[PDB]
């Protein structure tokens, strides 16, 4: 009975974990921030309409410039826009048309991409020949690339649908570390501001806190009822949001090691598919399947505004690194830039 | 605008033109999602008609693209919405596994799940009932009644095969939006691809007459 006793020990130890994280939960975050004055109503006007794609755009990532963004659609091409003038600076034809993710390097030299082809292909923008060229094809995943995030021009963490996150080395093209704790397709991914440890949300309805250097699940955050399709760190780095198919966002704290509050509403029943905090982290952006975005007061859980501009469900959503604009991107093949 | 901003806008317009031309060139190829039960006769129909696997073949000035996706072991509900707006869904069912473990009921489950999906509410299904020549003799030894106990018919091929066809064509719940084109995969030169071509031109004609606002 060395299996049954071990499973029973696992259950008792999970009960201990729940008892511990219950013992240090005295005041609900909502109750502490009851006296904070609200942010009123936040009215955002679509400034730009980046209109080039001919299919459902699946991902989008701002450059650290806060001016260049890259959007990847399923027409088989990802475009690099100049957001300030709505100009296209590059149009990169992909080998595989099926794309679920897209990342822009923090330096701005490289752009990663991946989808149902299981390969995270990295493109070299700043070349001597003036044409965007495929640098590497990071193969080794057995699922499908659900998210990619650049650490440096050398390292990249990838989130596949084979229940494993992997840290790559672009030059060698081999996996450095394989993070394997999930029991469901890992749908989203978010780097800490310092890139010392990241967090991944899986179809297991549980987010996990990984360490990039060790490769060990530090903490596991449960609470969601369905697949979690979006993760984003709080700008502090000691909290992250989690969008699920429950149509609820939850803000977990890393130090408290539990959820603080939930961003639910009665007439919201469509599964959220993208989250992002503002620069200060006060208002939490949230991209629903209602074909509109929402703006939650991330300290009070009361809704502040609605970015309703899209004819189809918003896939991608990103706040600029200077917190100047958000860029929603939906299946109507348009991605607006609100402000 | 300045001397460089004008040249940047010119580049933007030129790559936008190339993007539009690539879009209108790639939007004229008919796309077909290739589904089927685990270890069905997918190999036979993918080899006769010529991660994710894409096979591009042409037949009578019509360029087909079949996306054999069944090689992917993950949550099918998490990437199946990528294949909405596909022309047809080629769904091959190994007719010879009516008894093996059952597997026919599992293929029925998959068909019922994908035919009545949110995304494929209007995309016509081209159901292939392959491995006909084995099923021909297999029923004479093993009765079909073990798979369908509510089947009171002759233990012969032409009735049993027609019963399986009727049981599959029953599972669709919207018989007005979407059609189901069934074929019994034959070893004849080009009859399989001919049937695919016929079904695809049919759905294309219906889509075009809908686009004219005339149907």
């Amino acid at each position, epitope marked *: 009975s060395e299996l049954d006793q071990l499973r029973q020990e696992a259950e008792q130890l999970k009960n201990q974990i729940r008892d511990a994280r219950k013992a240090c939960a005295d005041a609900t975050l909502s109750q502490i921030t009851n006296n904070i004055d609200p942010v009123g109503r936040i009215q955002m006007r679509t400034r730009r309409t980046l209109r080039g794609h001919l299919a459902k755009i699946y991902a989008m990532h701002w450059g650290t410039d806060s*001016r*260049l963004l890259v959007s990847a659609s399923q027409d088989g091409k990802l475009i690099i826009w*100049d957001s300030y*003038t709505t*100009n296209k*600076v*590059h149009a990169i034809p992909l080998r595989s048309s099926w794309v679920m993710t897209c990342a822009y390097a923090p330096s*701005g030299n490289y752009v990663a991409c991946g989808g149902l082809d299981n390969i995270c292909s990295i493109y070299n923008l*700043k070349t*001597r*020949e*003036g*044409n965007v060229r495929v640098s590497r094809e990071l193969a080794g995943h057995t699922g499908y690339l659900s998210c990619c995030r650049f650490l440096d021009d050398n390292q990249i963490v990838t989130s596949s649908g084979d229940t494993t996150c992997a840290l790559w080395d672009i030059e060698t093209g081999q996996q450095t570390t394989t993070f394997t704790g999930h029991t469901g397709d890992v749908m989203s991914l978010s780097l800490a501001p310092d890139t010392r440890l990241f967090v991944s949300g899986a179809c297991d309805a549980s987010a996990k806190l990984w360490d990039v250097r060790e490769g060990m699940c530090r903490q596991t955050f449960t609470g969601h009822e369905s697949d979690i399709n979006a993760i984003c760190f709080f700008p502090n780095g000691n909290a992250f949001a989690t969008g699920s198919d429950d149509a609820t966002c939850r803000l977990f704290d890393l130090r408290a090691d539990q959820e603080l509050m939930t961003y639910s509403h009665d007439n919201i029943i469509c599964g959220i598919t993208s989250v992002s905090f503002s620069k200060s982290g006060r208002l939490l952006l949230a991209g629903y399947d209602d074909f509109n975005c929402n703006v939650w007061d991330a300290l009070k859980a009361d809704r502040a505004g609605v970015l309703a501009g899209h004819d189809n469900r918003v896939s991608c959503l990103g706040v600029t690194d200077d917190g100047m604009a958000v860029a929603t991107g939906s299946w109507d093949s348009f991605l607006k830039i609100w402000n | 605008l*300045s*001397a*460089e*901003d*004008k*040249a*940047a806008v*010119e*580049r933007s317009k*030129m790559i936008d033109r190339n993007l539009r031309e690539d879009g209108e060139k790639a939007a004229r190829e008919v796309k077909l999602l290739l589904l089927g039960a685990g270890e069905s006769g997918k190999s036979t129909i993918v080899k006769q008609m010529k991660g994710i696997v894409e096979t591009h073949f042409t037949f009578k000035d019509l360029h087909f693209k079949m996306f054999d996706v069944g090689g992917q072991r993950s949550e099918r509900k998490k990437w199946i919405h990528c294949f909405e707006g596909v022309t047809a869904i080629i769904f091959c069912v190994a007719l010879s596994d009516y008894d093996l473990v059952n597997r026919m009921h599992e293929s029925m489950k998959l068909f019922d799940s994908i035919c009545n999906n949110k995304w494929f509410t209007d995309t016509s299904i081209i159901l292939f009932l392959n491995k006909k020549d084995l099923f021909e003799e297999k029923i004479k030894k093993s009765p079909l009644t073990i798979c369908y106990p509510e089947y009171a018919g002759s233990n012969t091929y032409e009735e049993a095969a027609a019963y399986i066809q009727c049981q599959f064509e029953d599972l669709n719940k919207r018989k007005d939006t979407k059609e189901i084109y069934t074929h019994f995969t034959c070893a004849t030169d080009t009859k399989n691809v001919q049937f695919v071509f016929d079904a695809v031109t049919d759905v294309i004609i219906k889509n075009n007459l809908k686009d004219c606002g005339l149907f």
Partner: single-chain antibody
Amino acid sequence: DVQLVESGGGLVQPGGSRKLSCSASGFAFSSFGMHWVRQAPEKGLEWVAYISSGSGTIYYADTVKGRFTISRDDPKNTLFLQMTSLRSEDTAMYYCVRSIYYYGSSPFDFWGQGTTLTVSSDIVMTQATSSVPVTPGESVSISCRSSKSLLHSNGNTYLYWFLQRPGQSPQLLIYRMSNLASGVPDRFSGSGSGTAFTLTISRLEAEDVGVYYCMQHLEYPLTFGAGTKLEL
């Protein structure tokens, strides 16, 4: 390995015709807006003509307008300058210069080797100093003032610094008076404001000697400086 090779130079009789061919090999030629700039036998550089990517935009210098015709064959990777009725003021070495224009691009980055052709309102860039001797290891400061303000409304201040070493083709050093060109050491630093600009070189070595040209890119006559020459 990008290379621009000009061919079609030689001695021509005045009022004749000639065609120069710049055969590009080693980059996406179809994506690059290509220029022609000439240099009189002992004078500074001078812009001649420009044809954008897809041939959709052309300009000419007022001196060579009507007489010269620029054209490119993108499939064959060749740039032409069909020049007619050659005057005694066209005896100059002609460079074909690639330039790509998008947000953050470095136009005029690579220059052709140059072909020798011999025959038998706009902005003015003033390089006050025309000669300054210098010893290696020191810090040198080259100045260039414009007439019109090159600081555009969008924030970009379009001024380029080129260096032409003896018996060479000029190479891009700094684009928009701040940004260092790719493969240039961090000794060169661009600074200044509208109608006042300065290229400072810290720890000068025996490779920086030559002529430093000051080009504006605000509007499309492209006017170079007279050129500051470094000696020892």
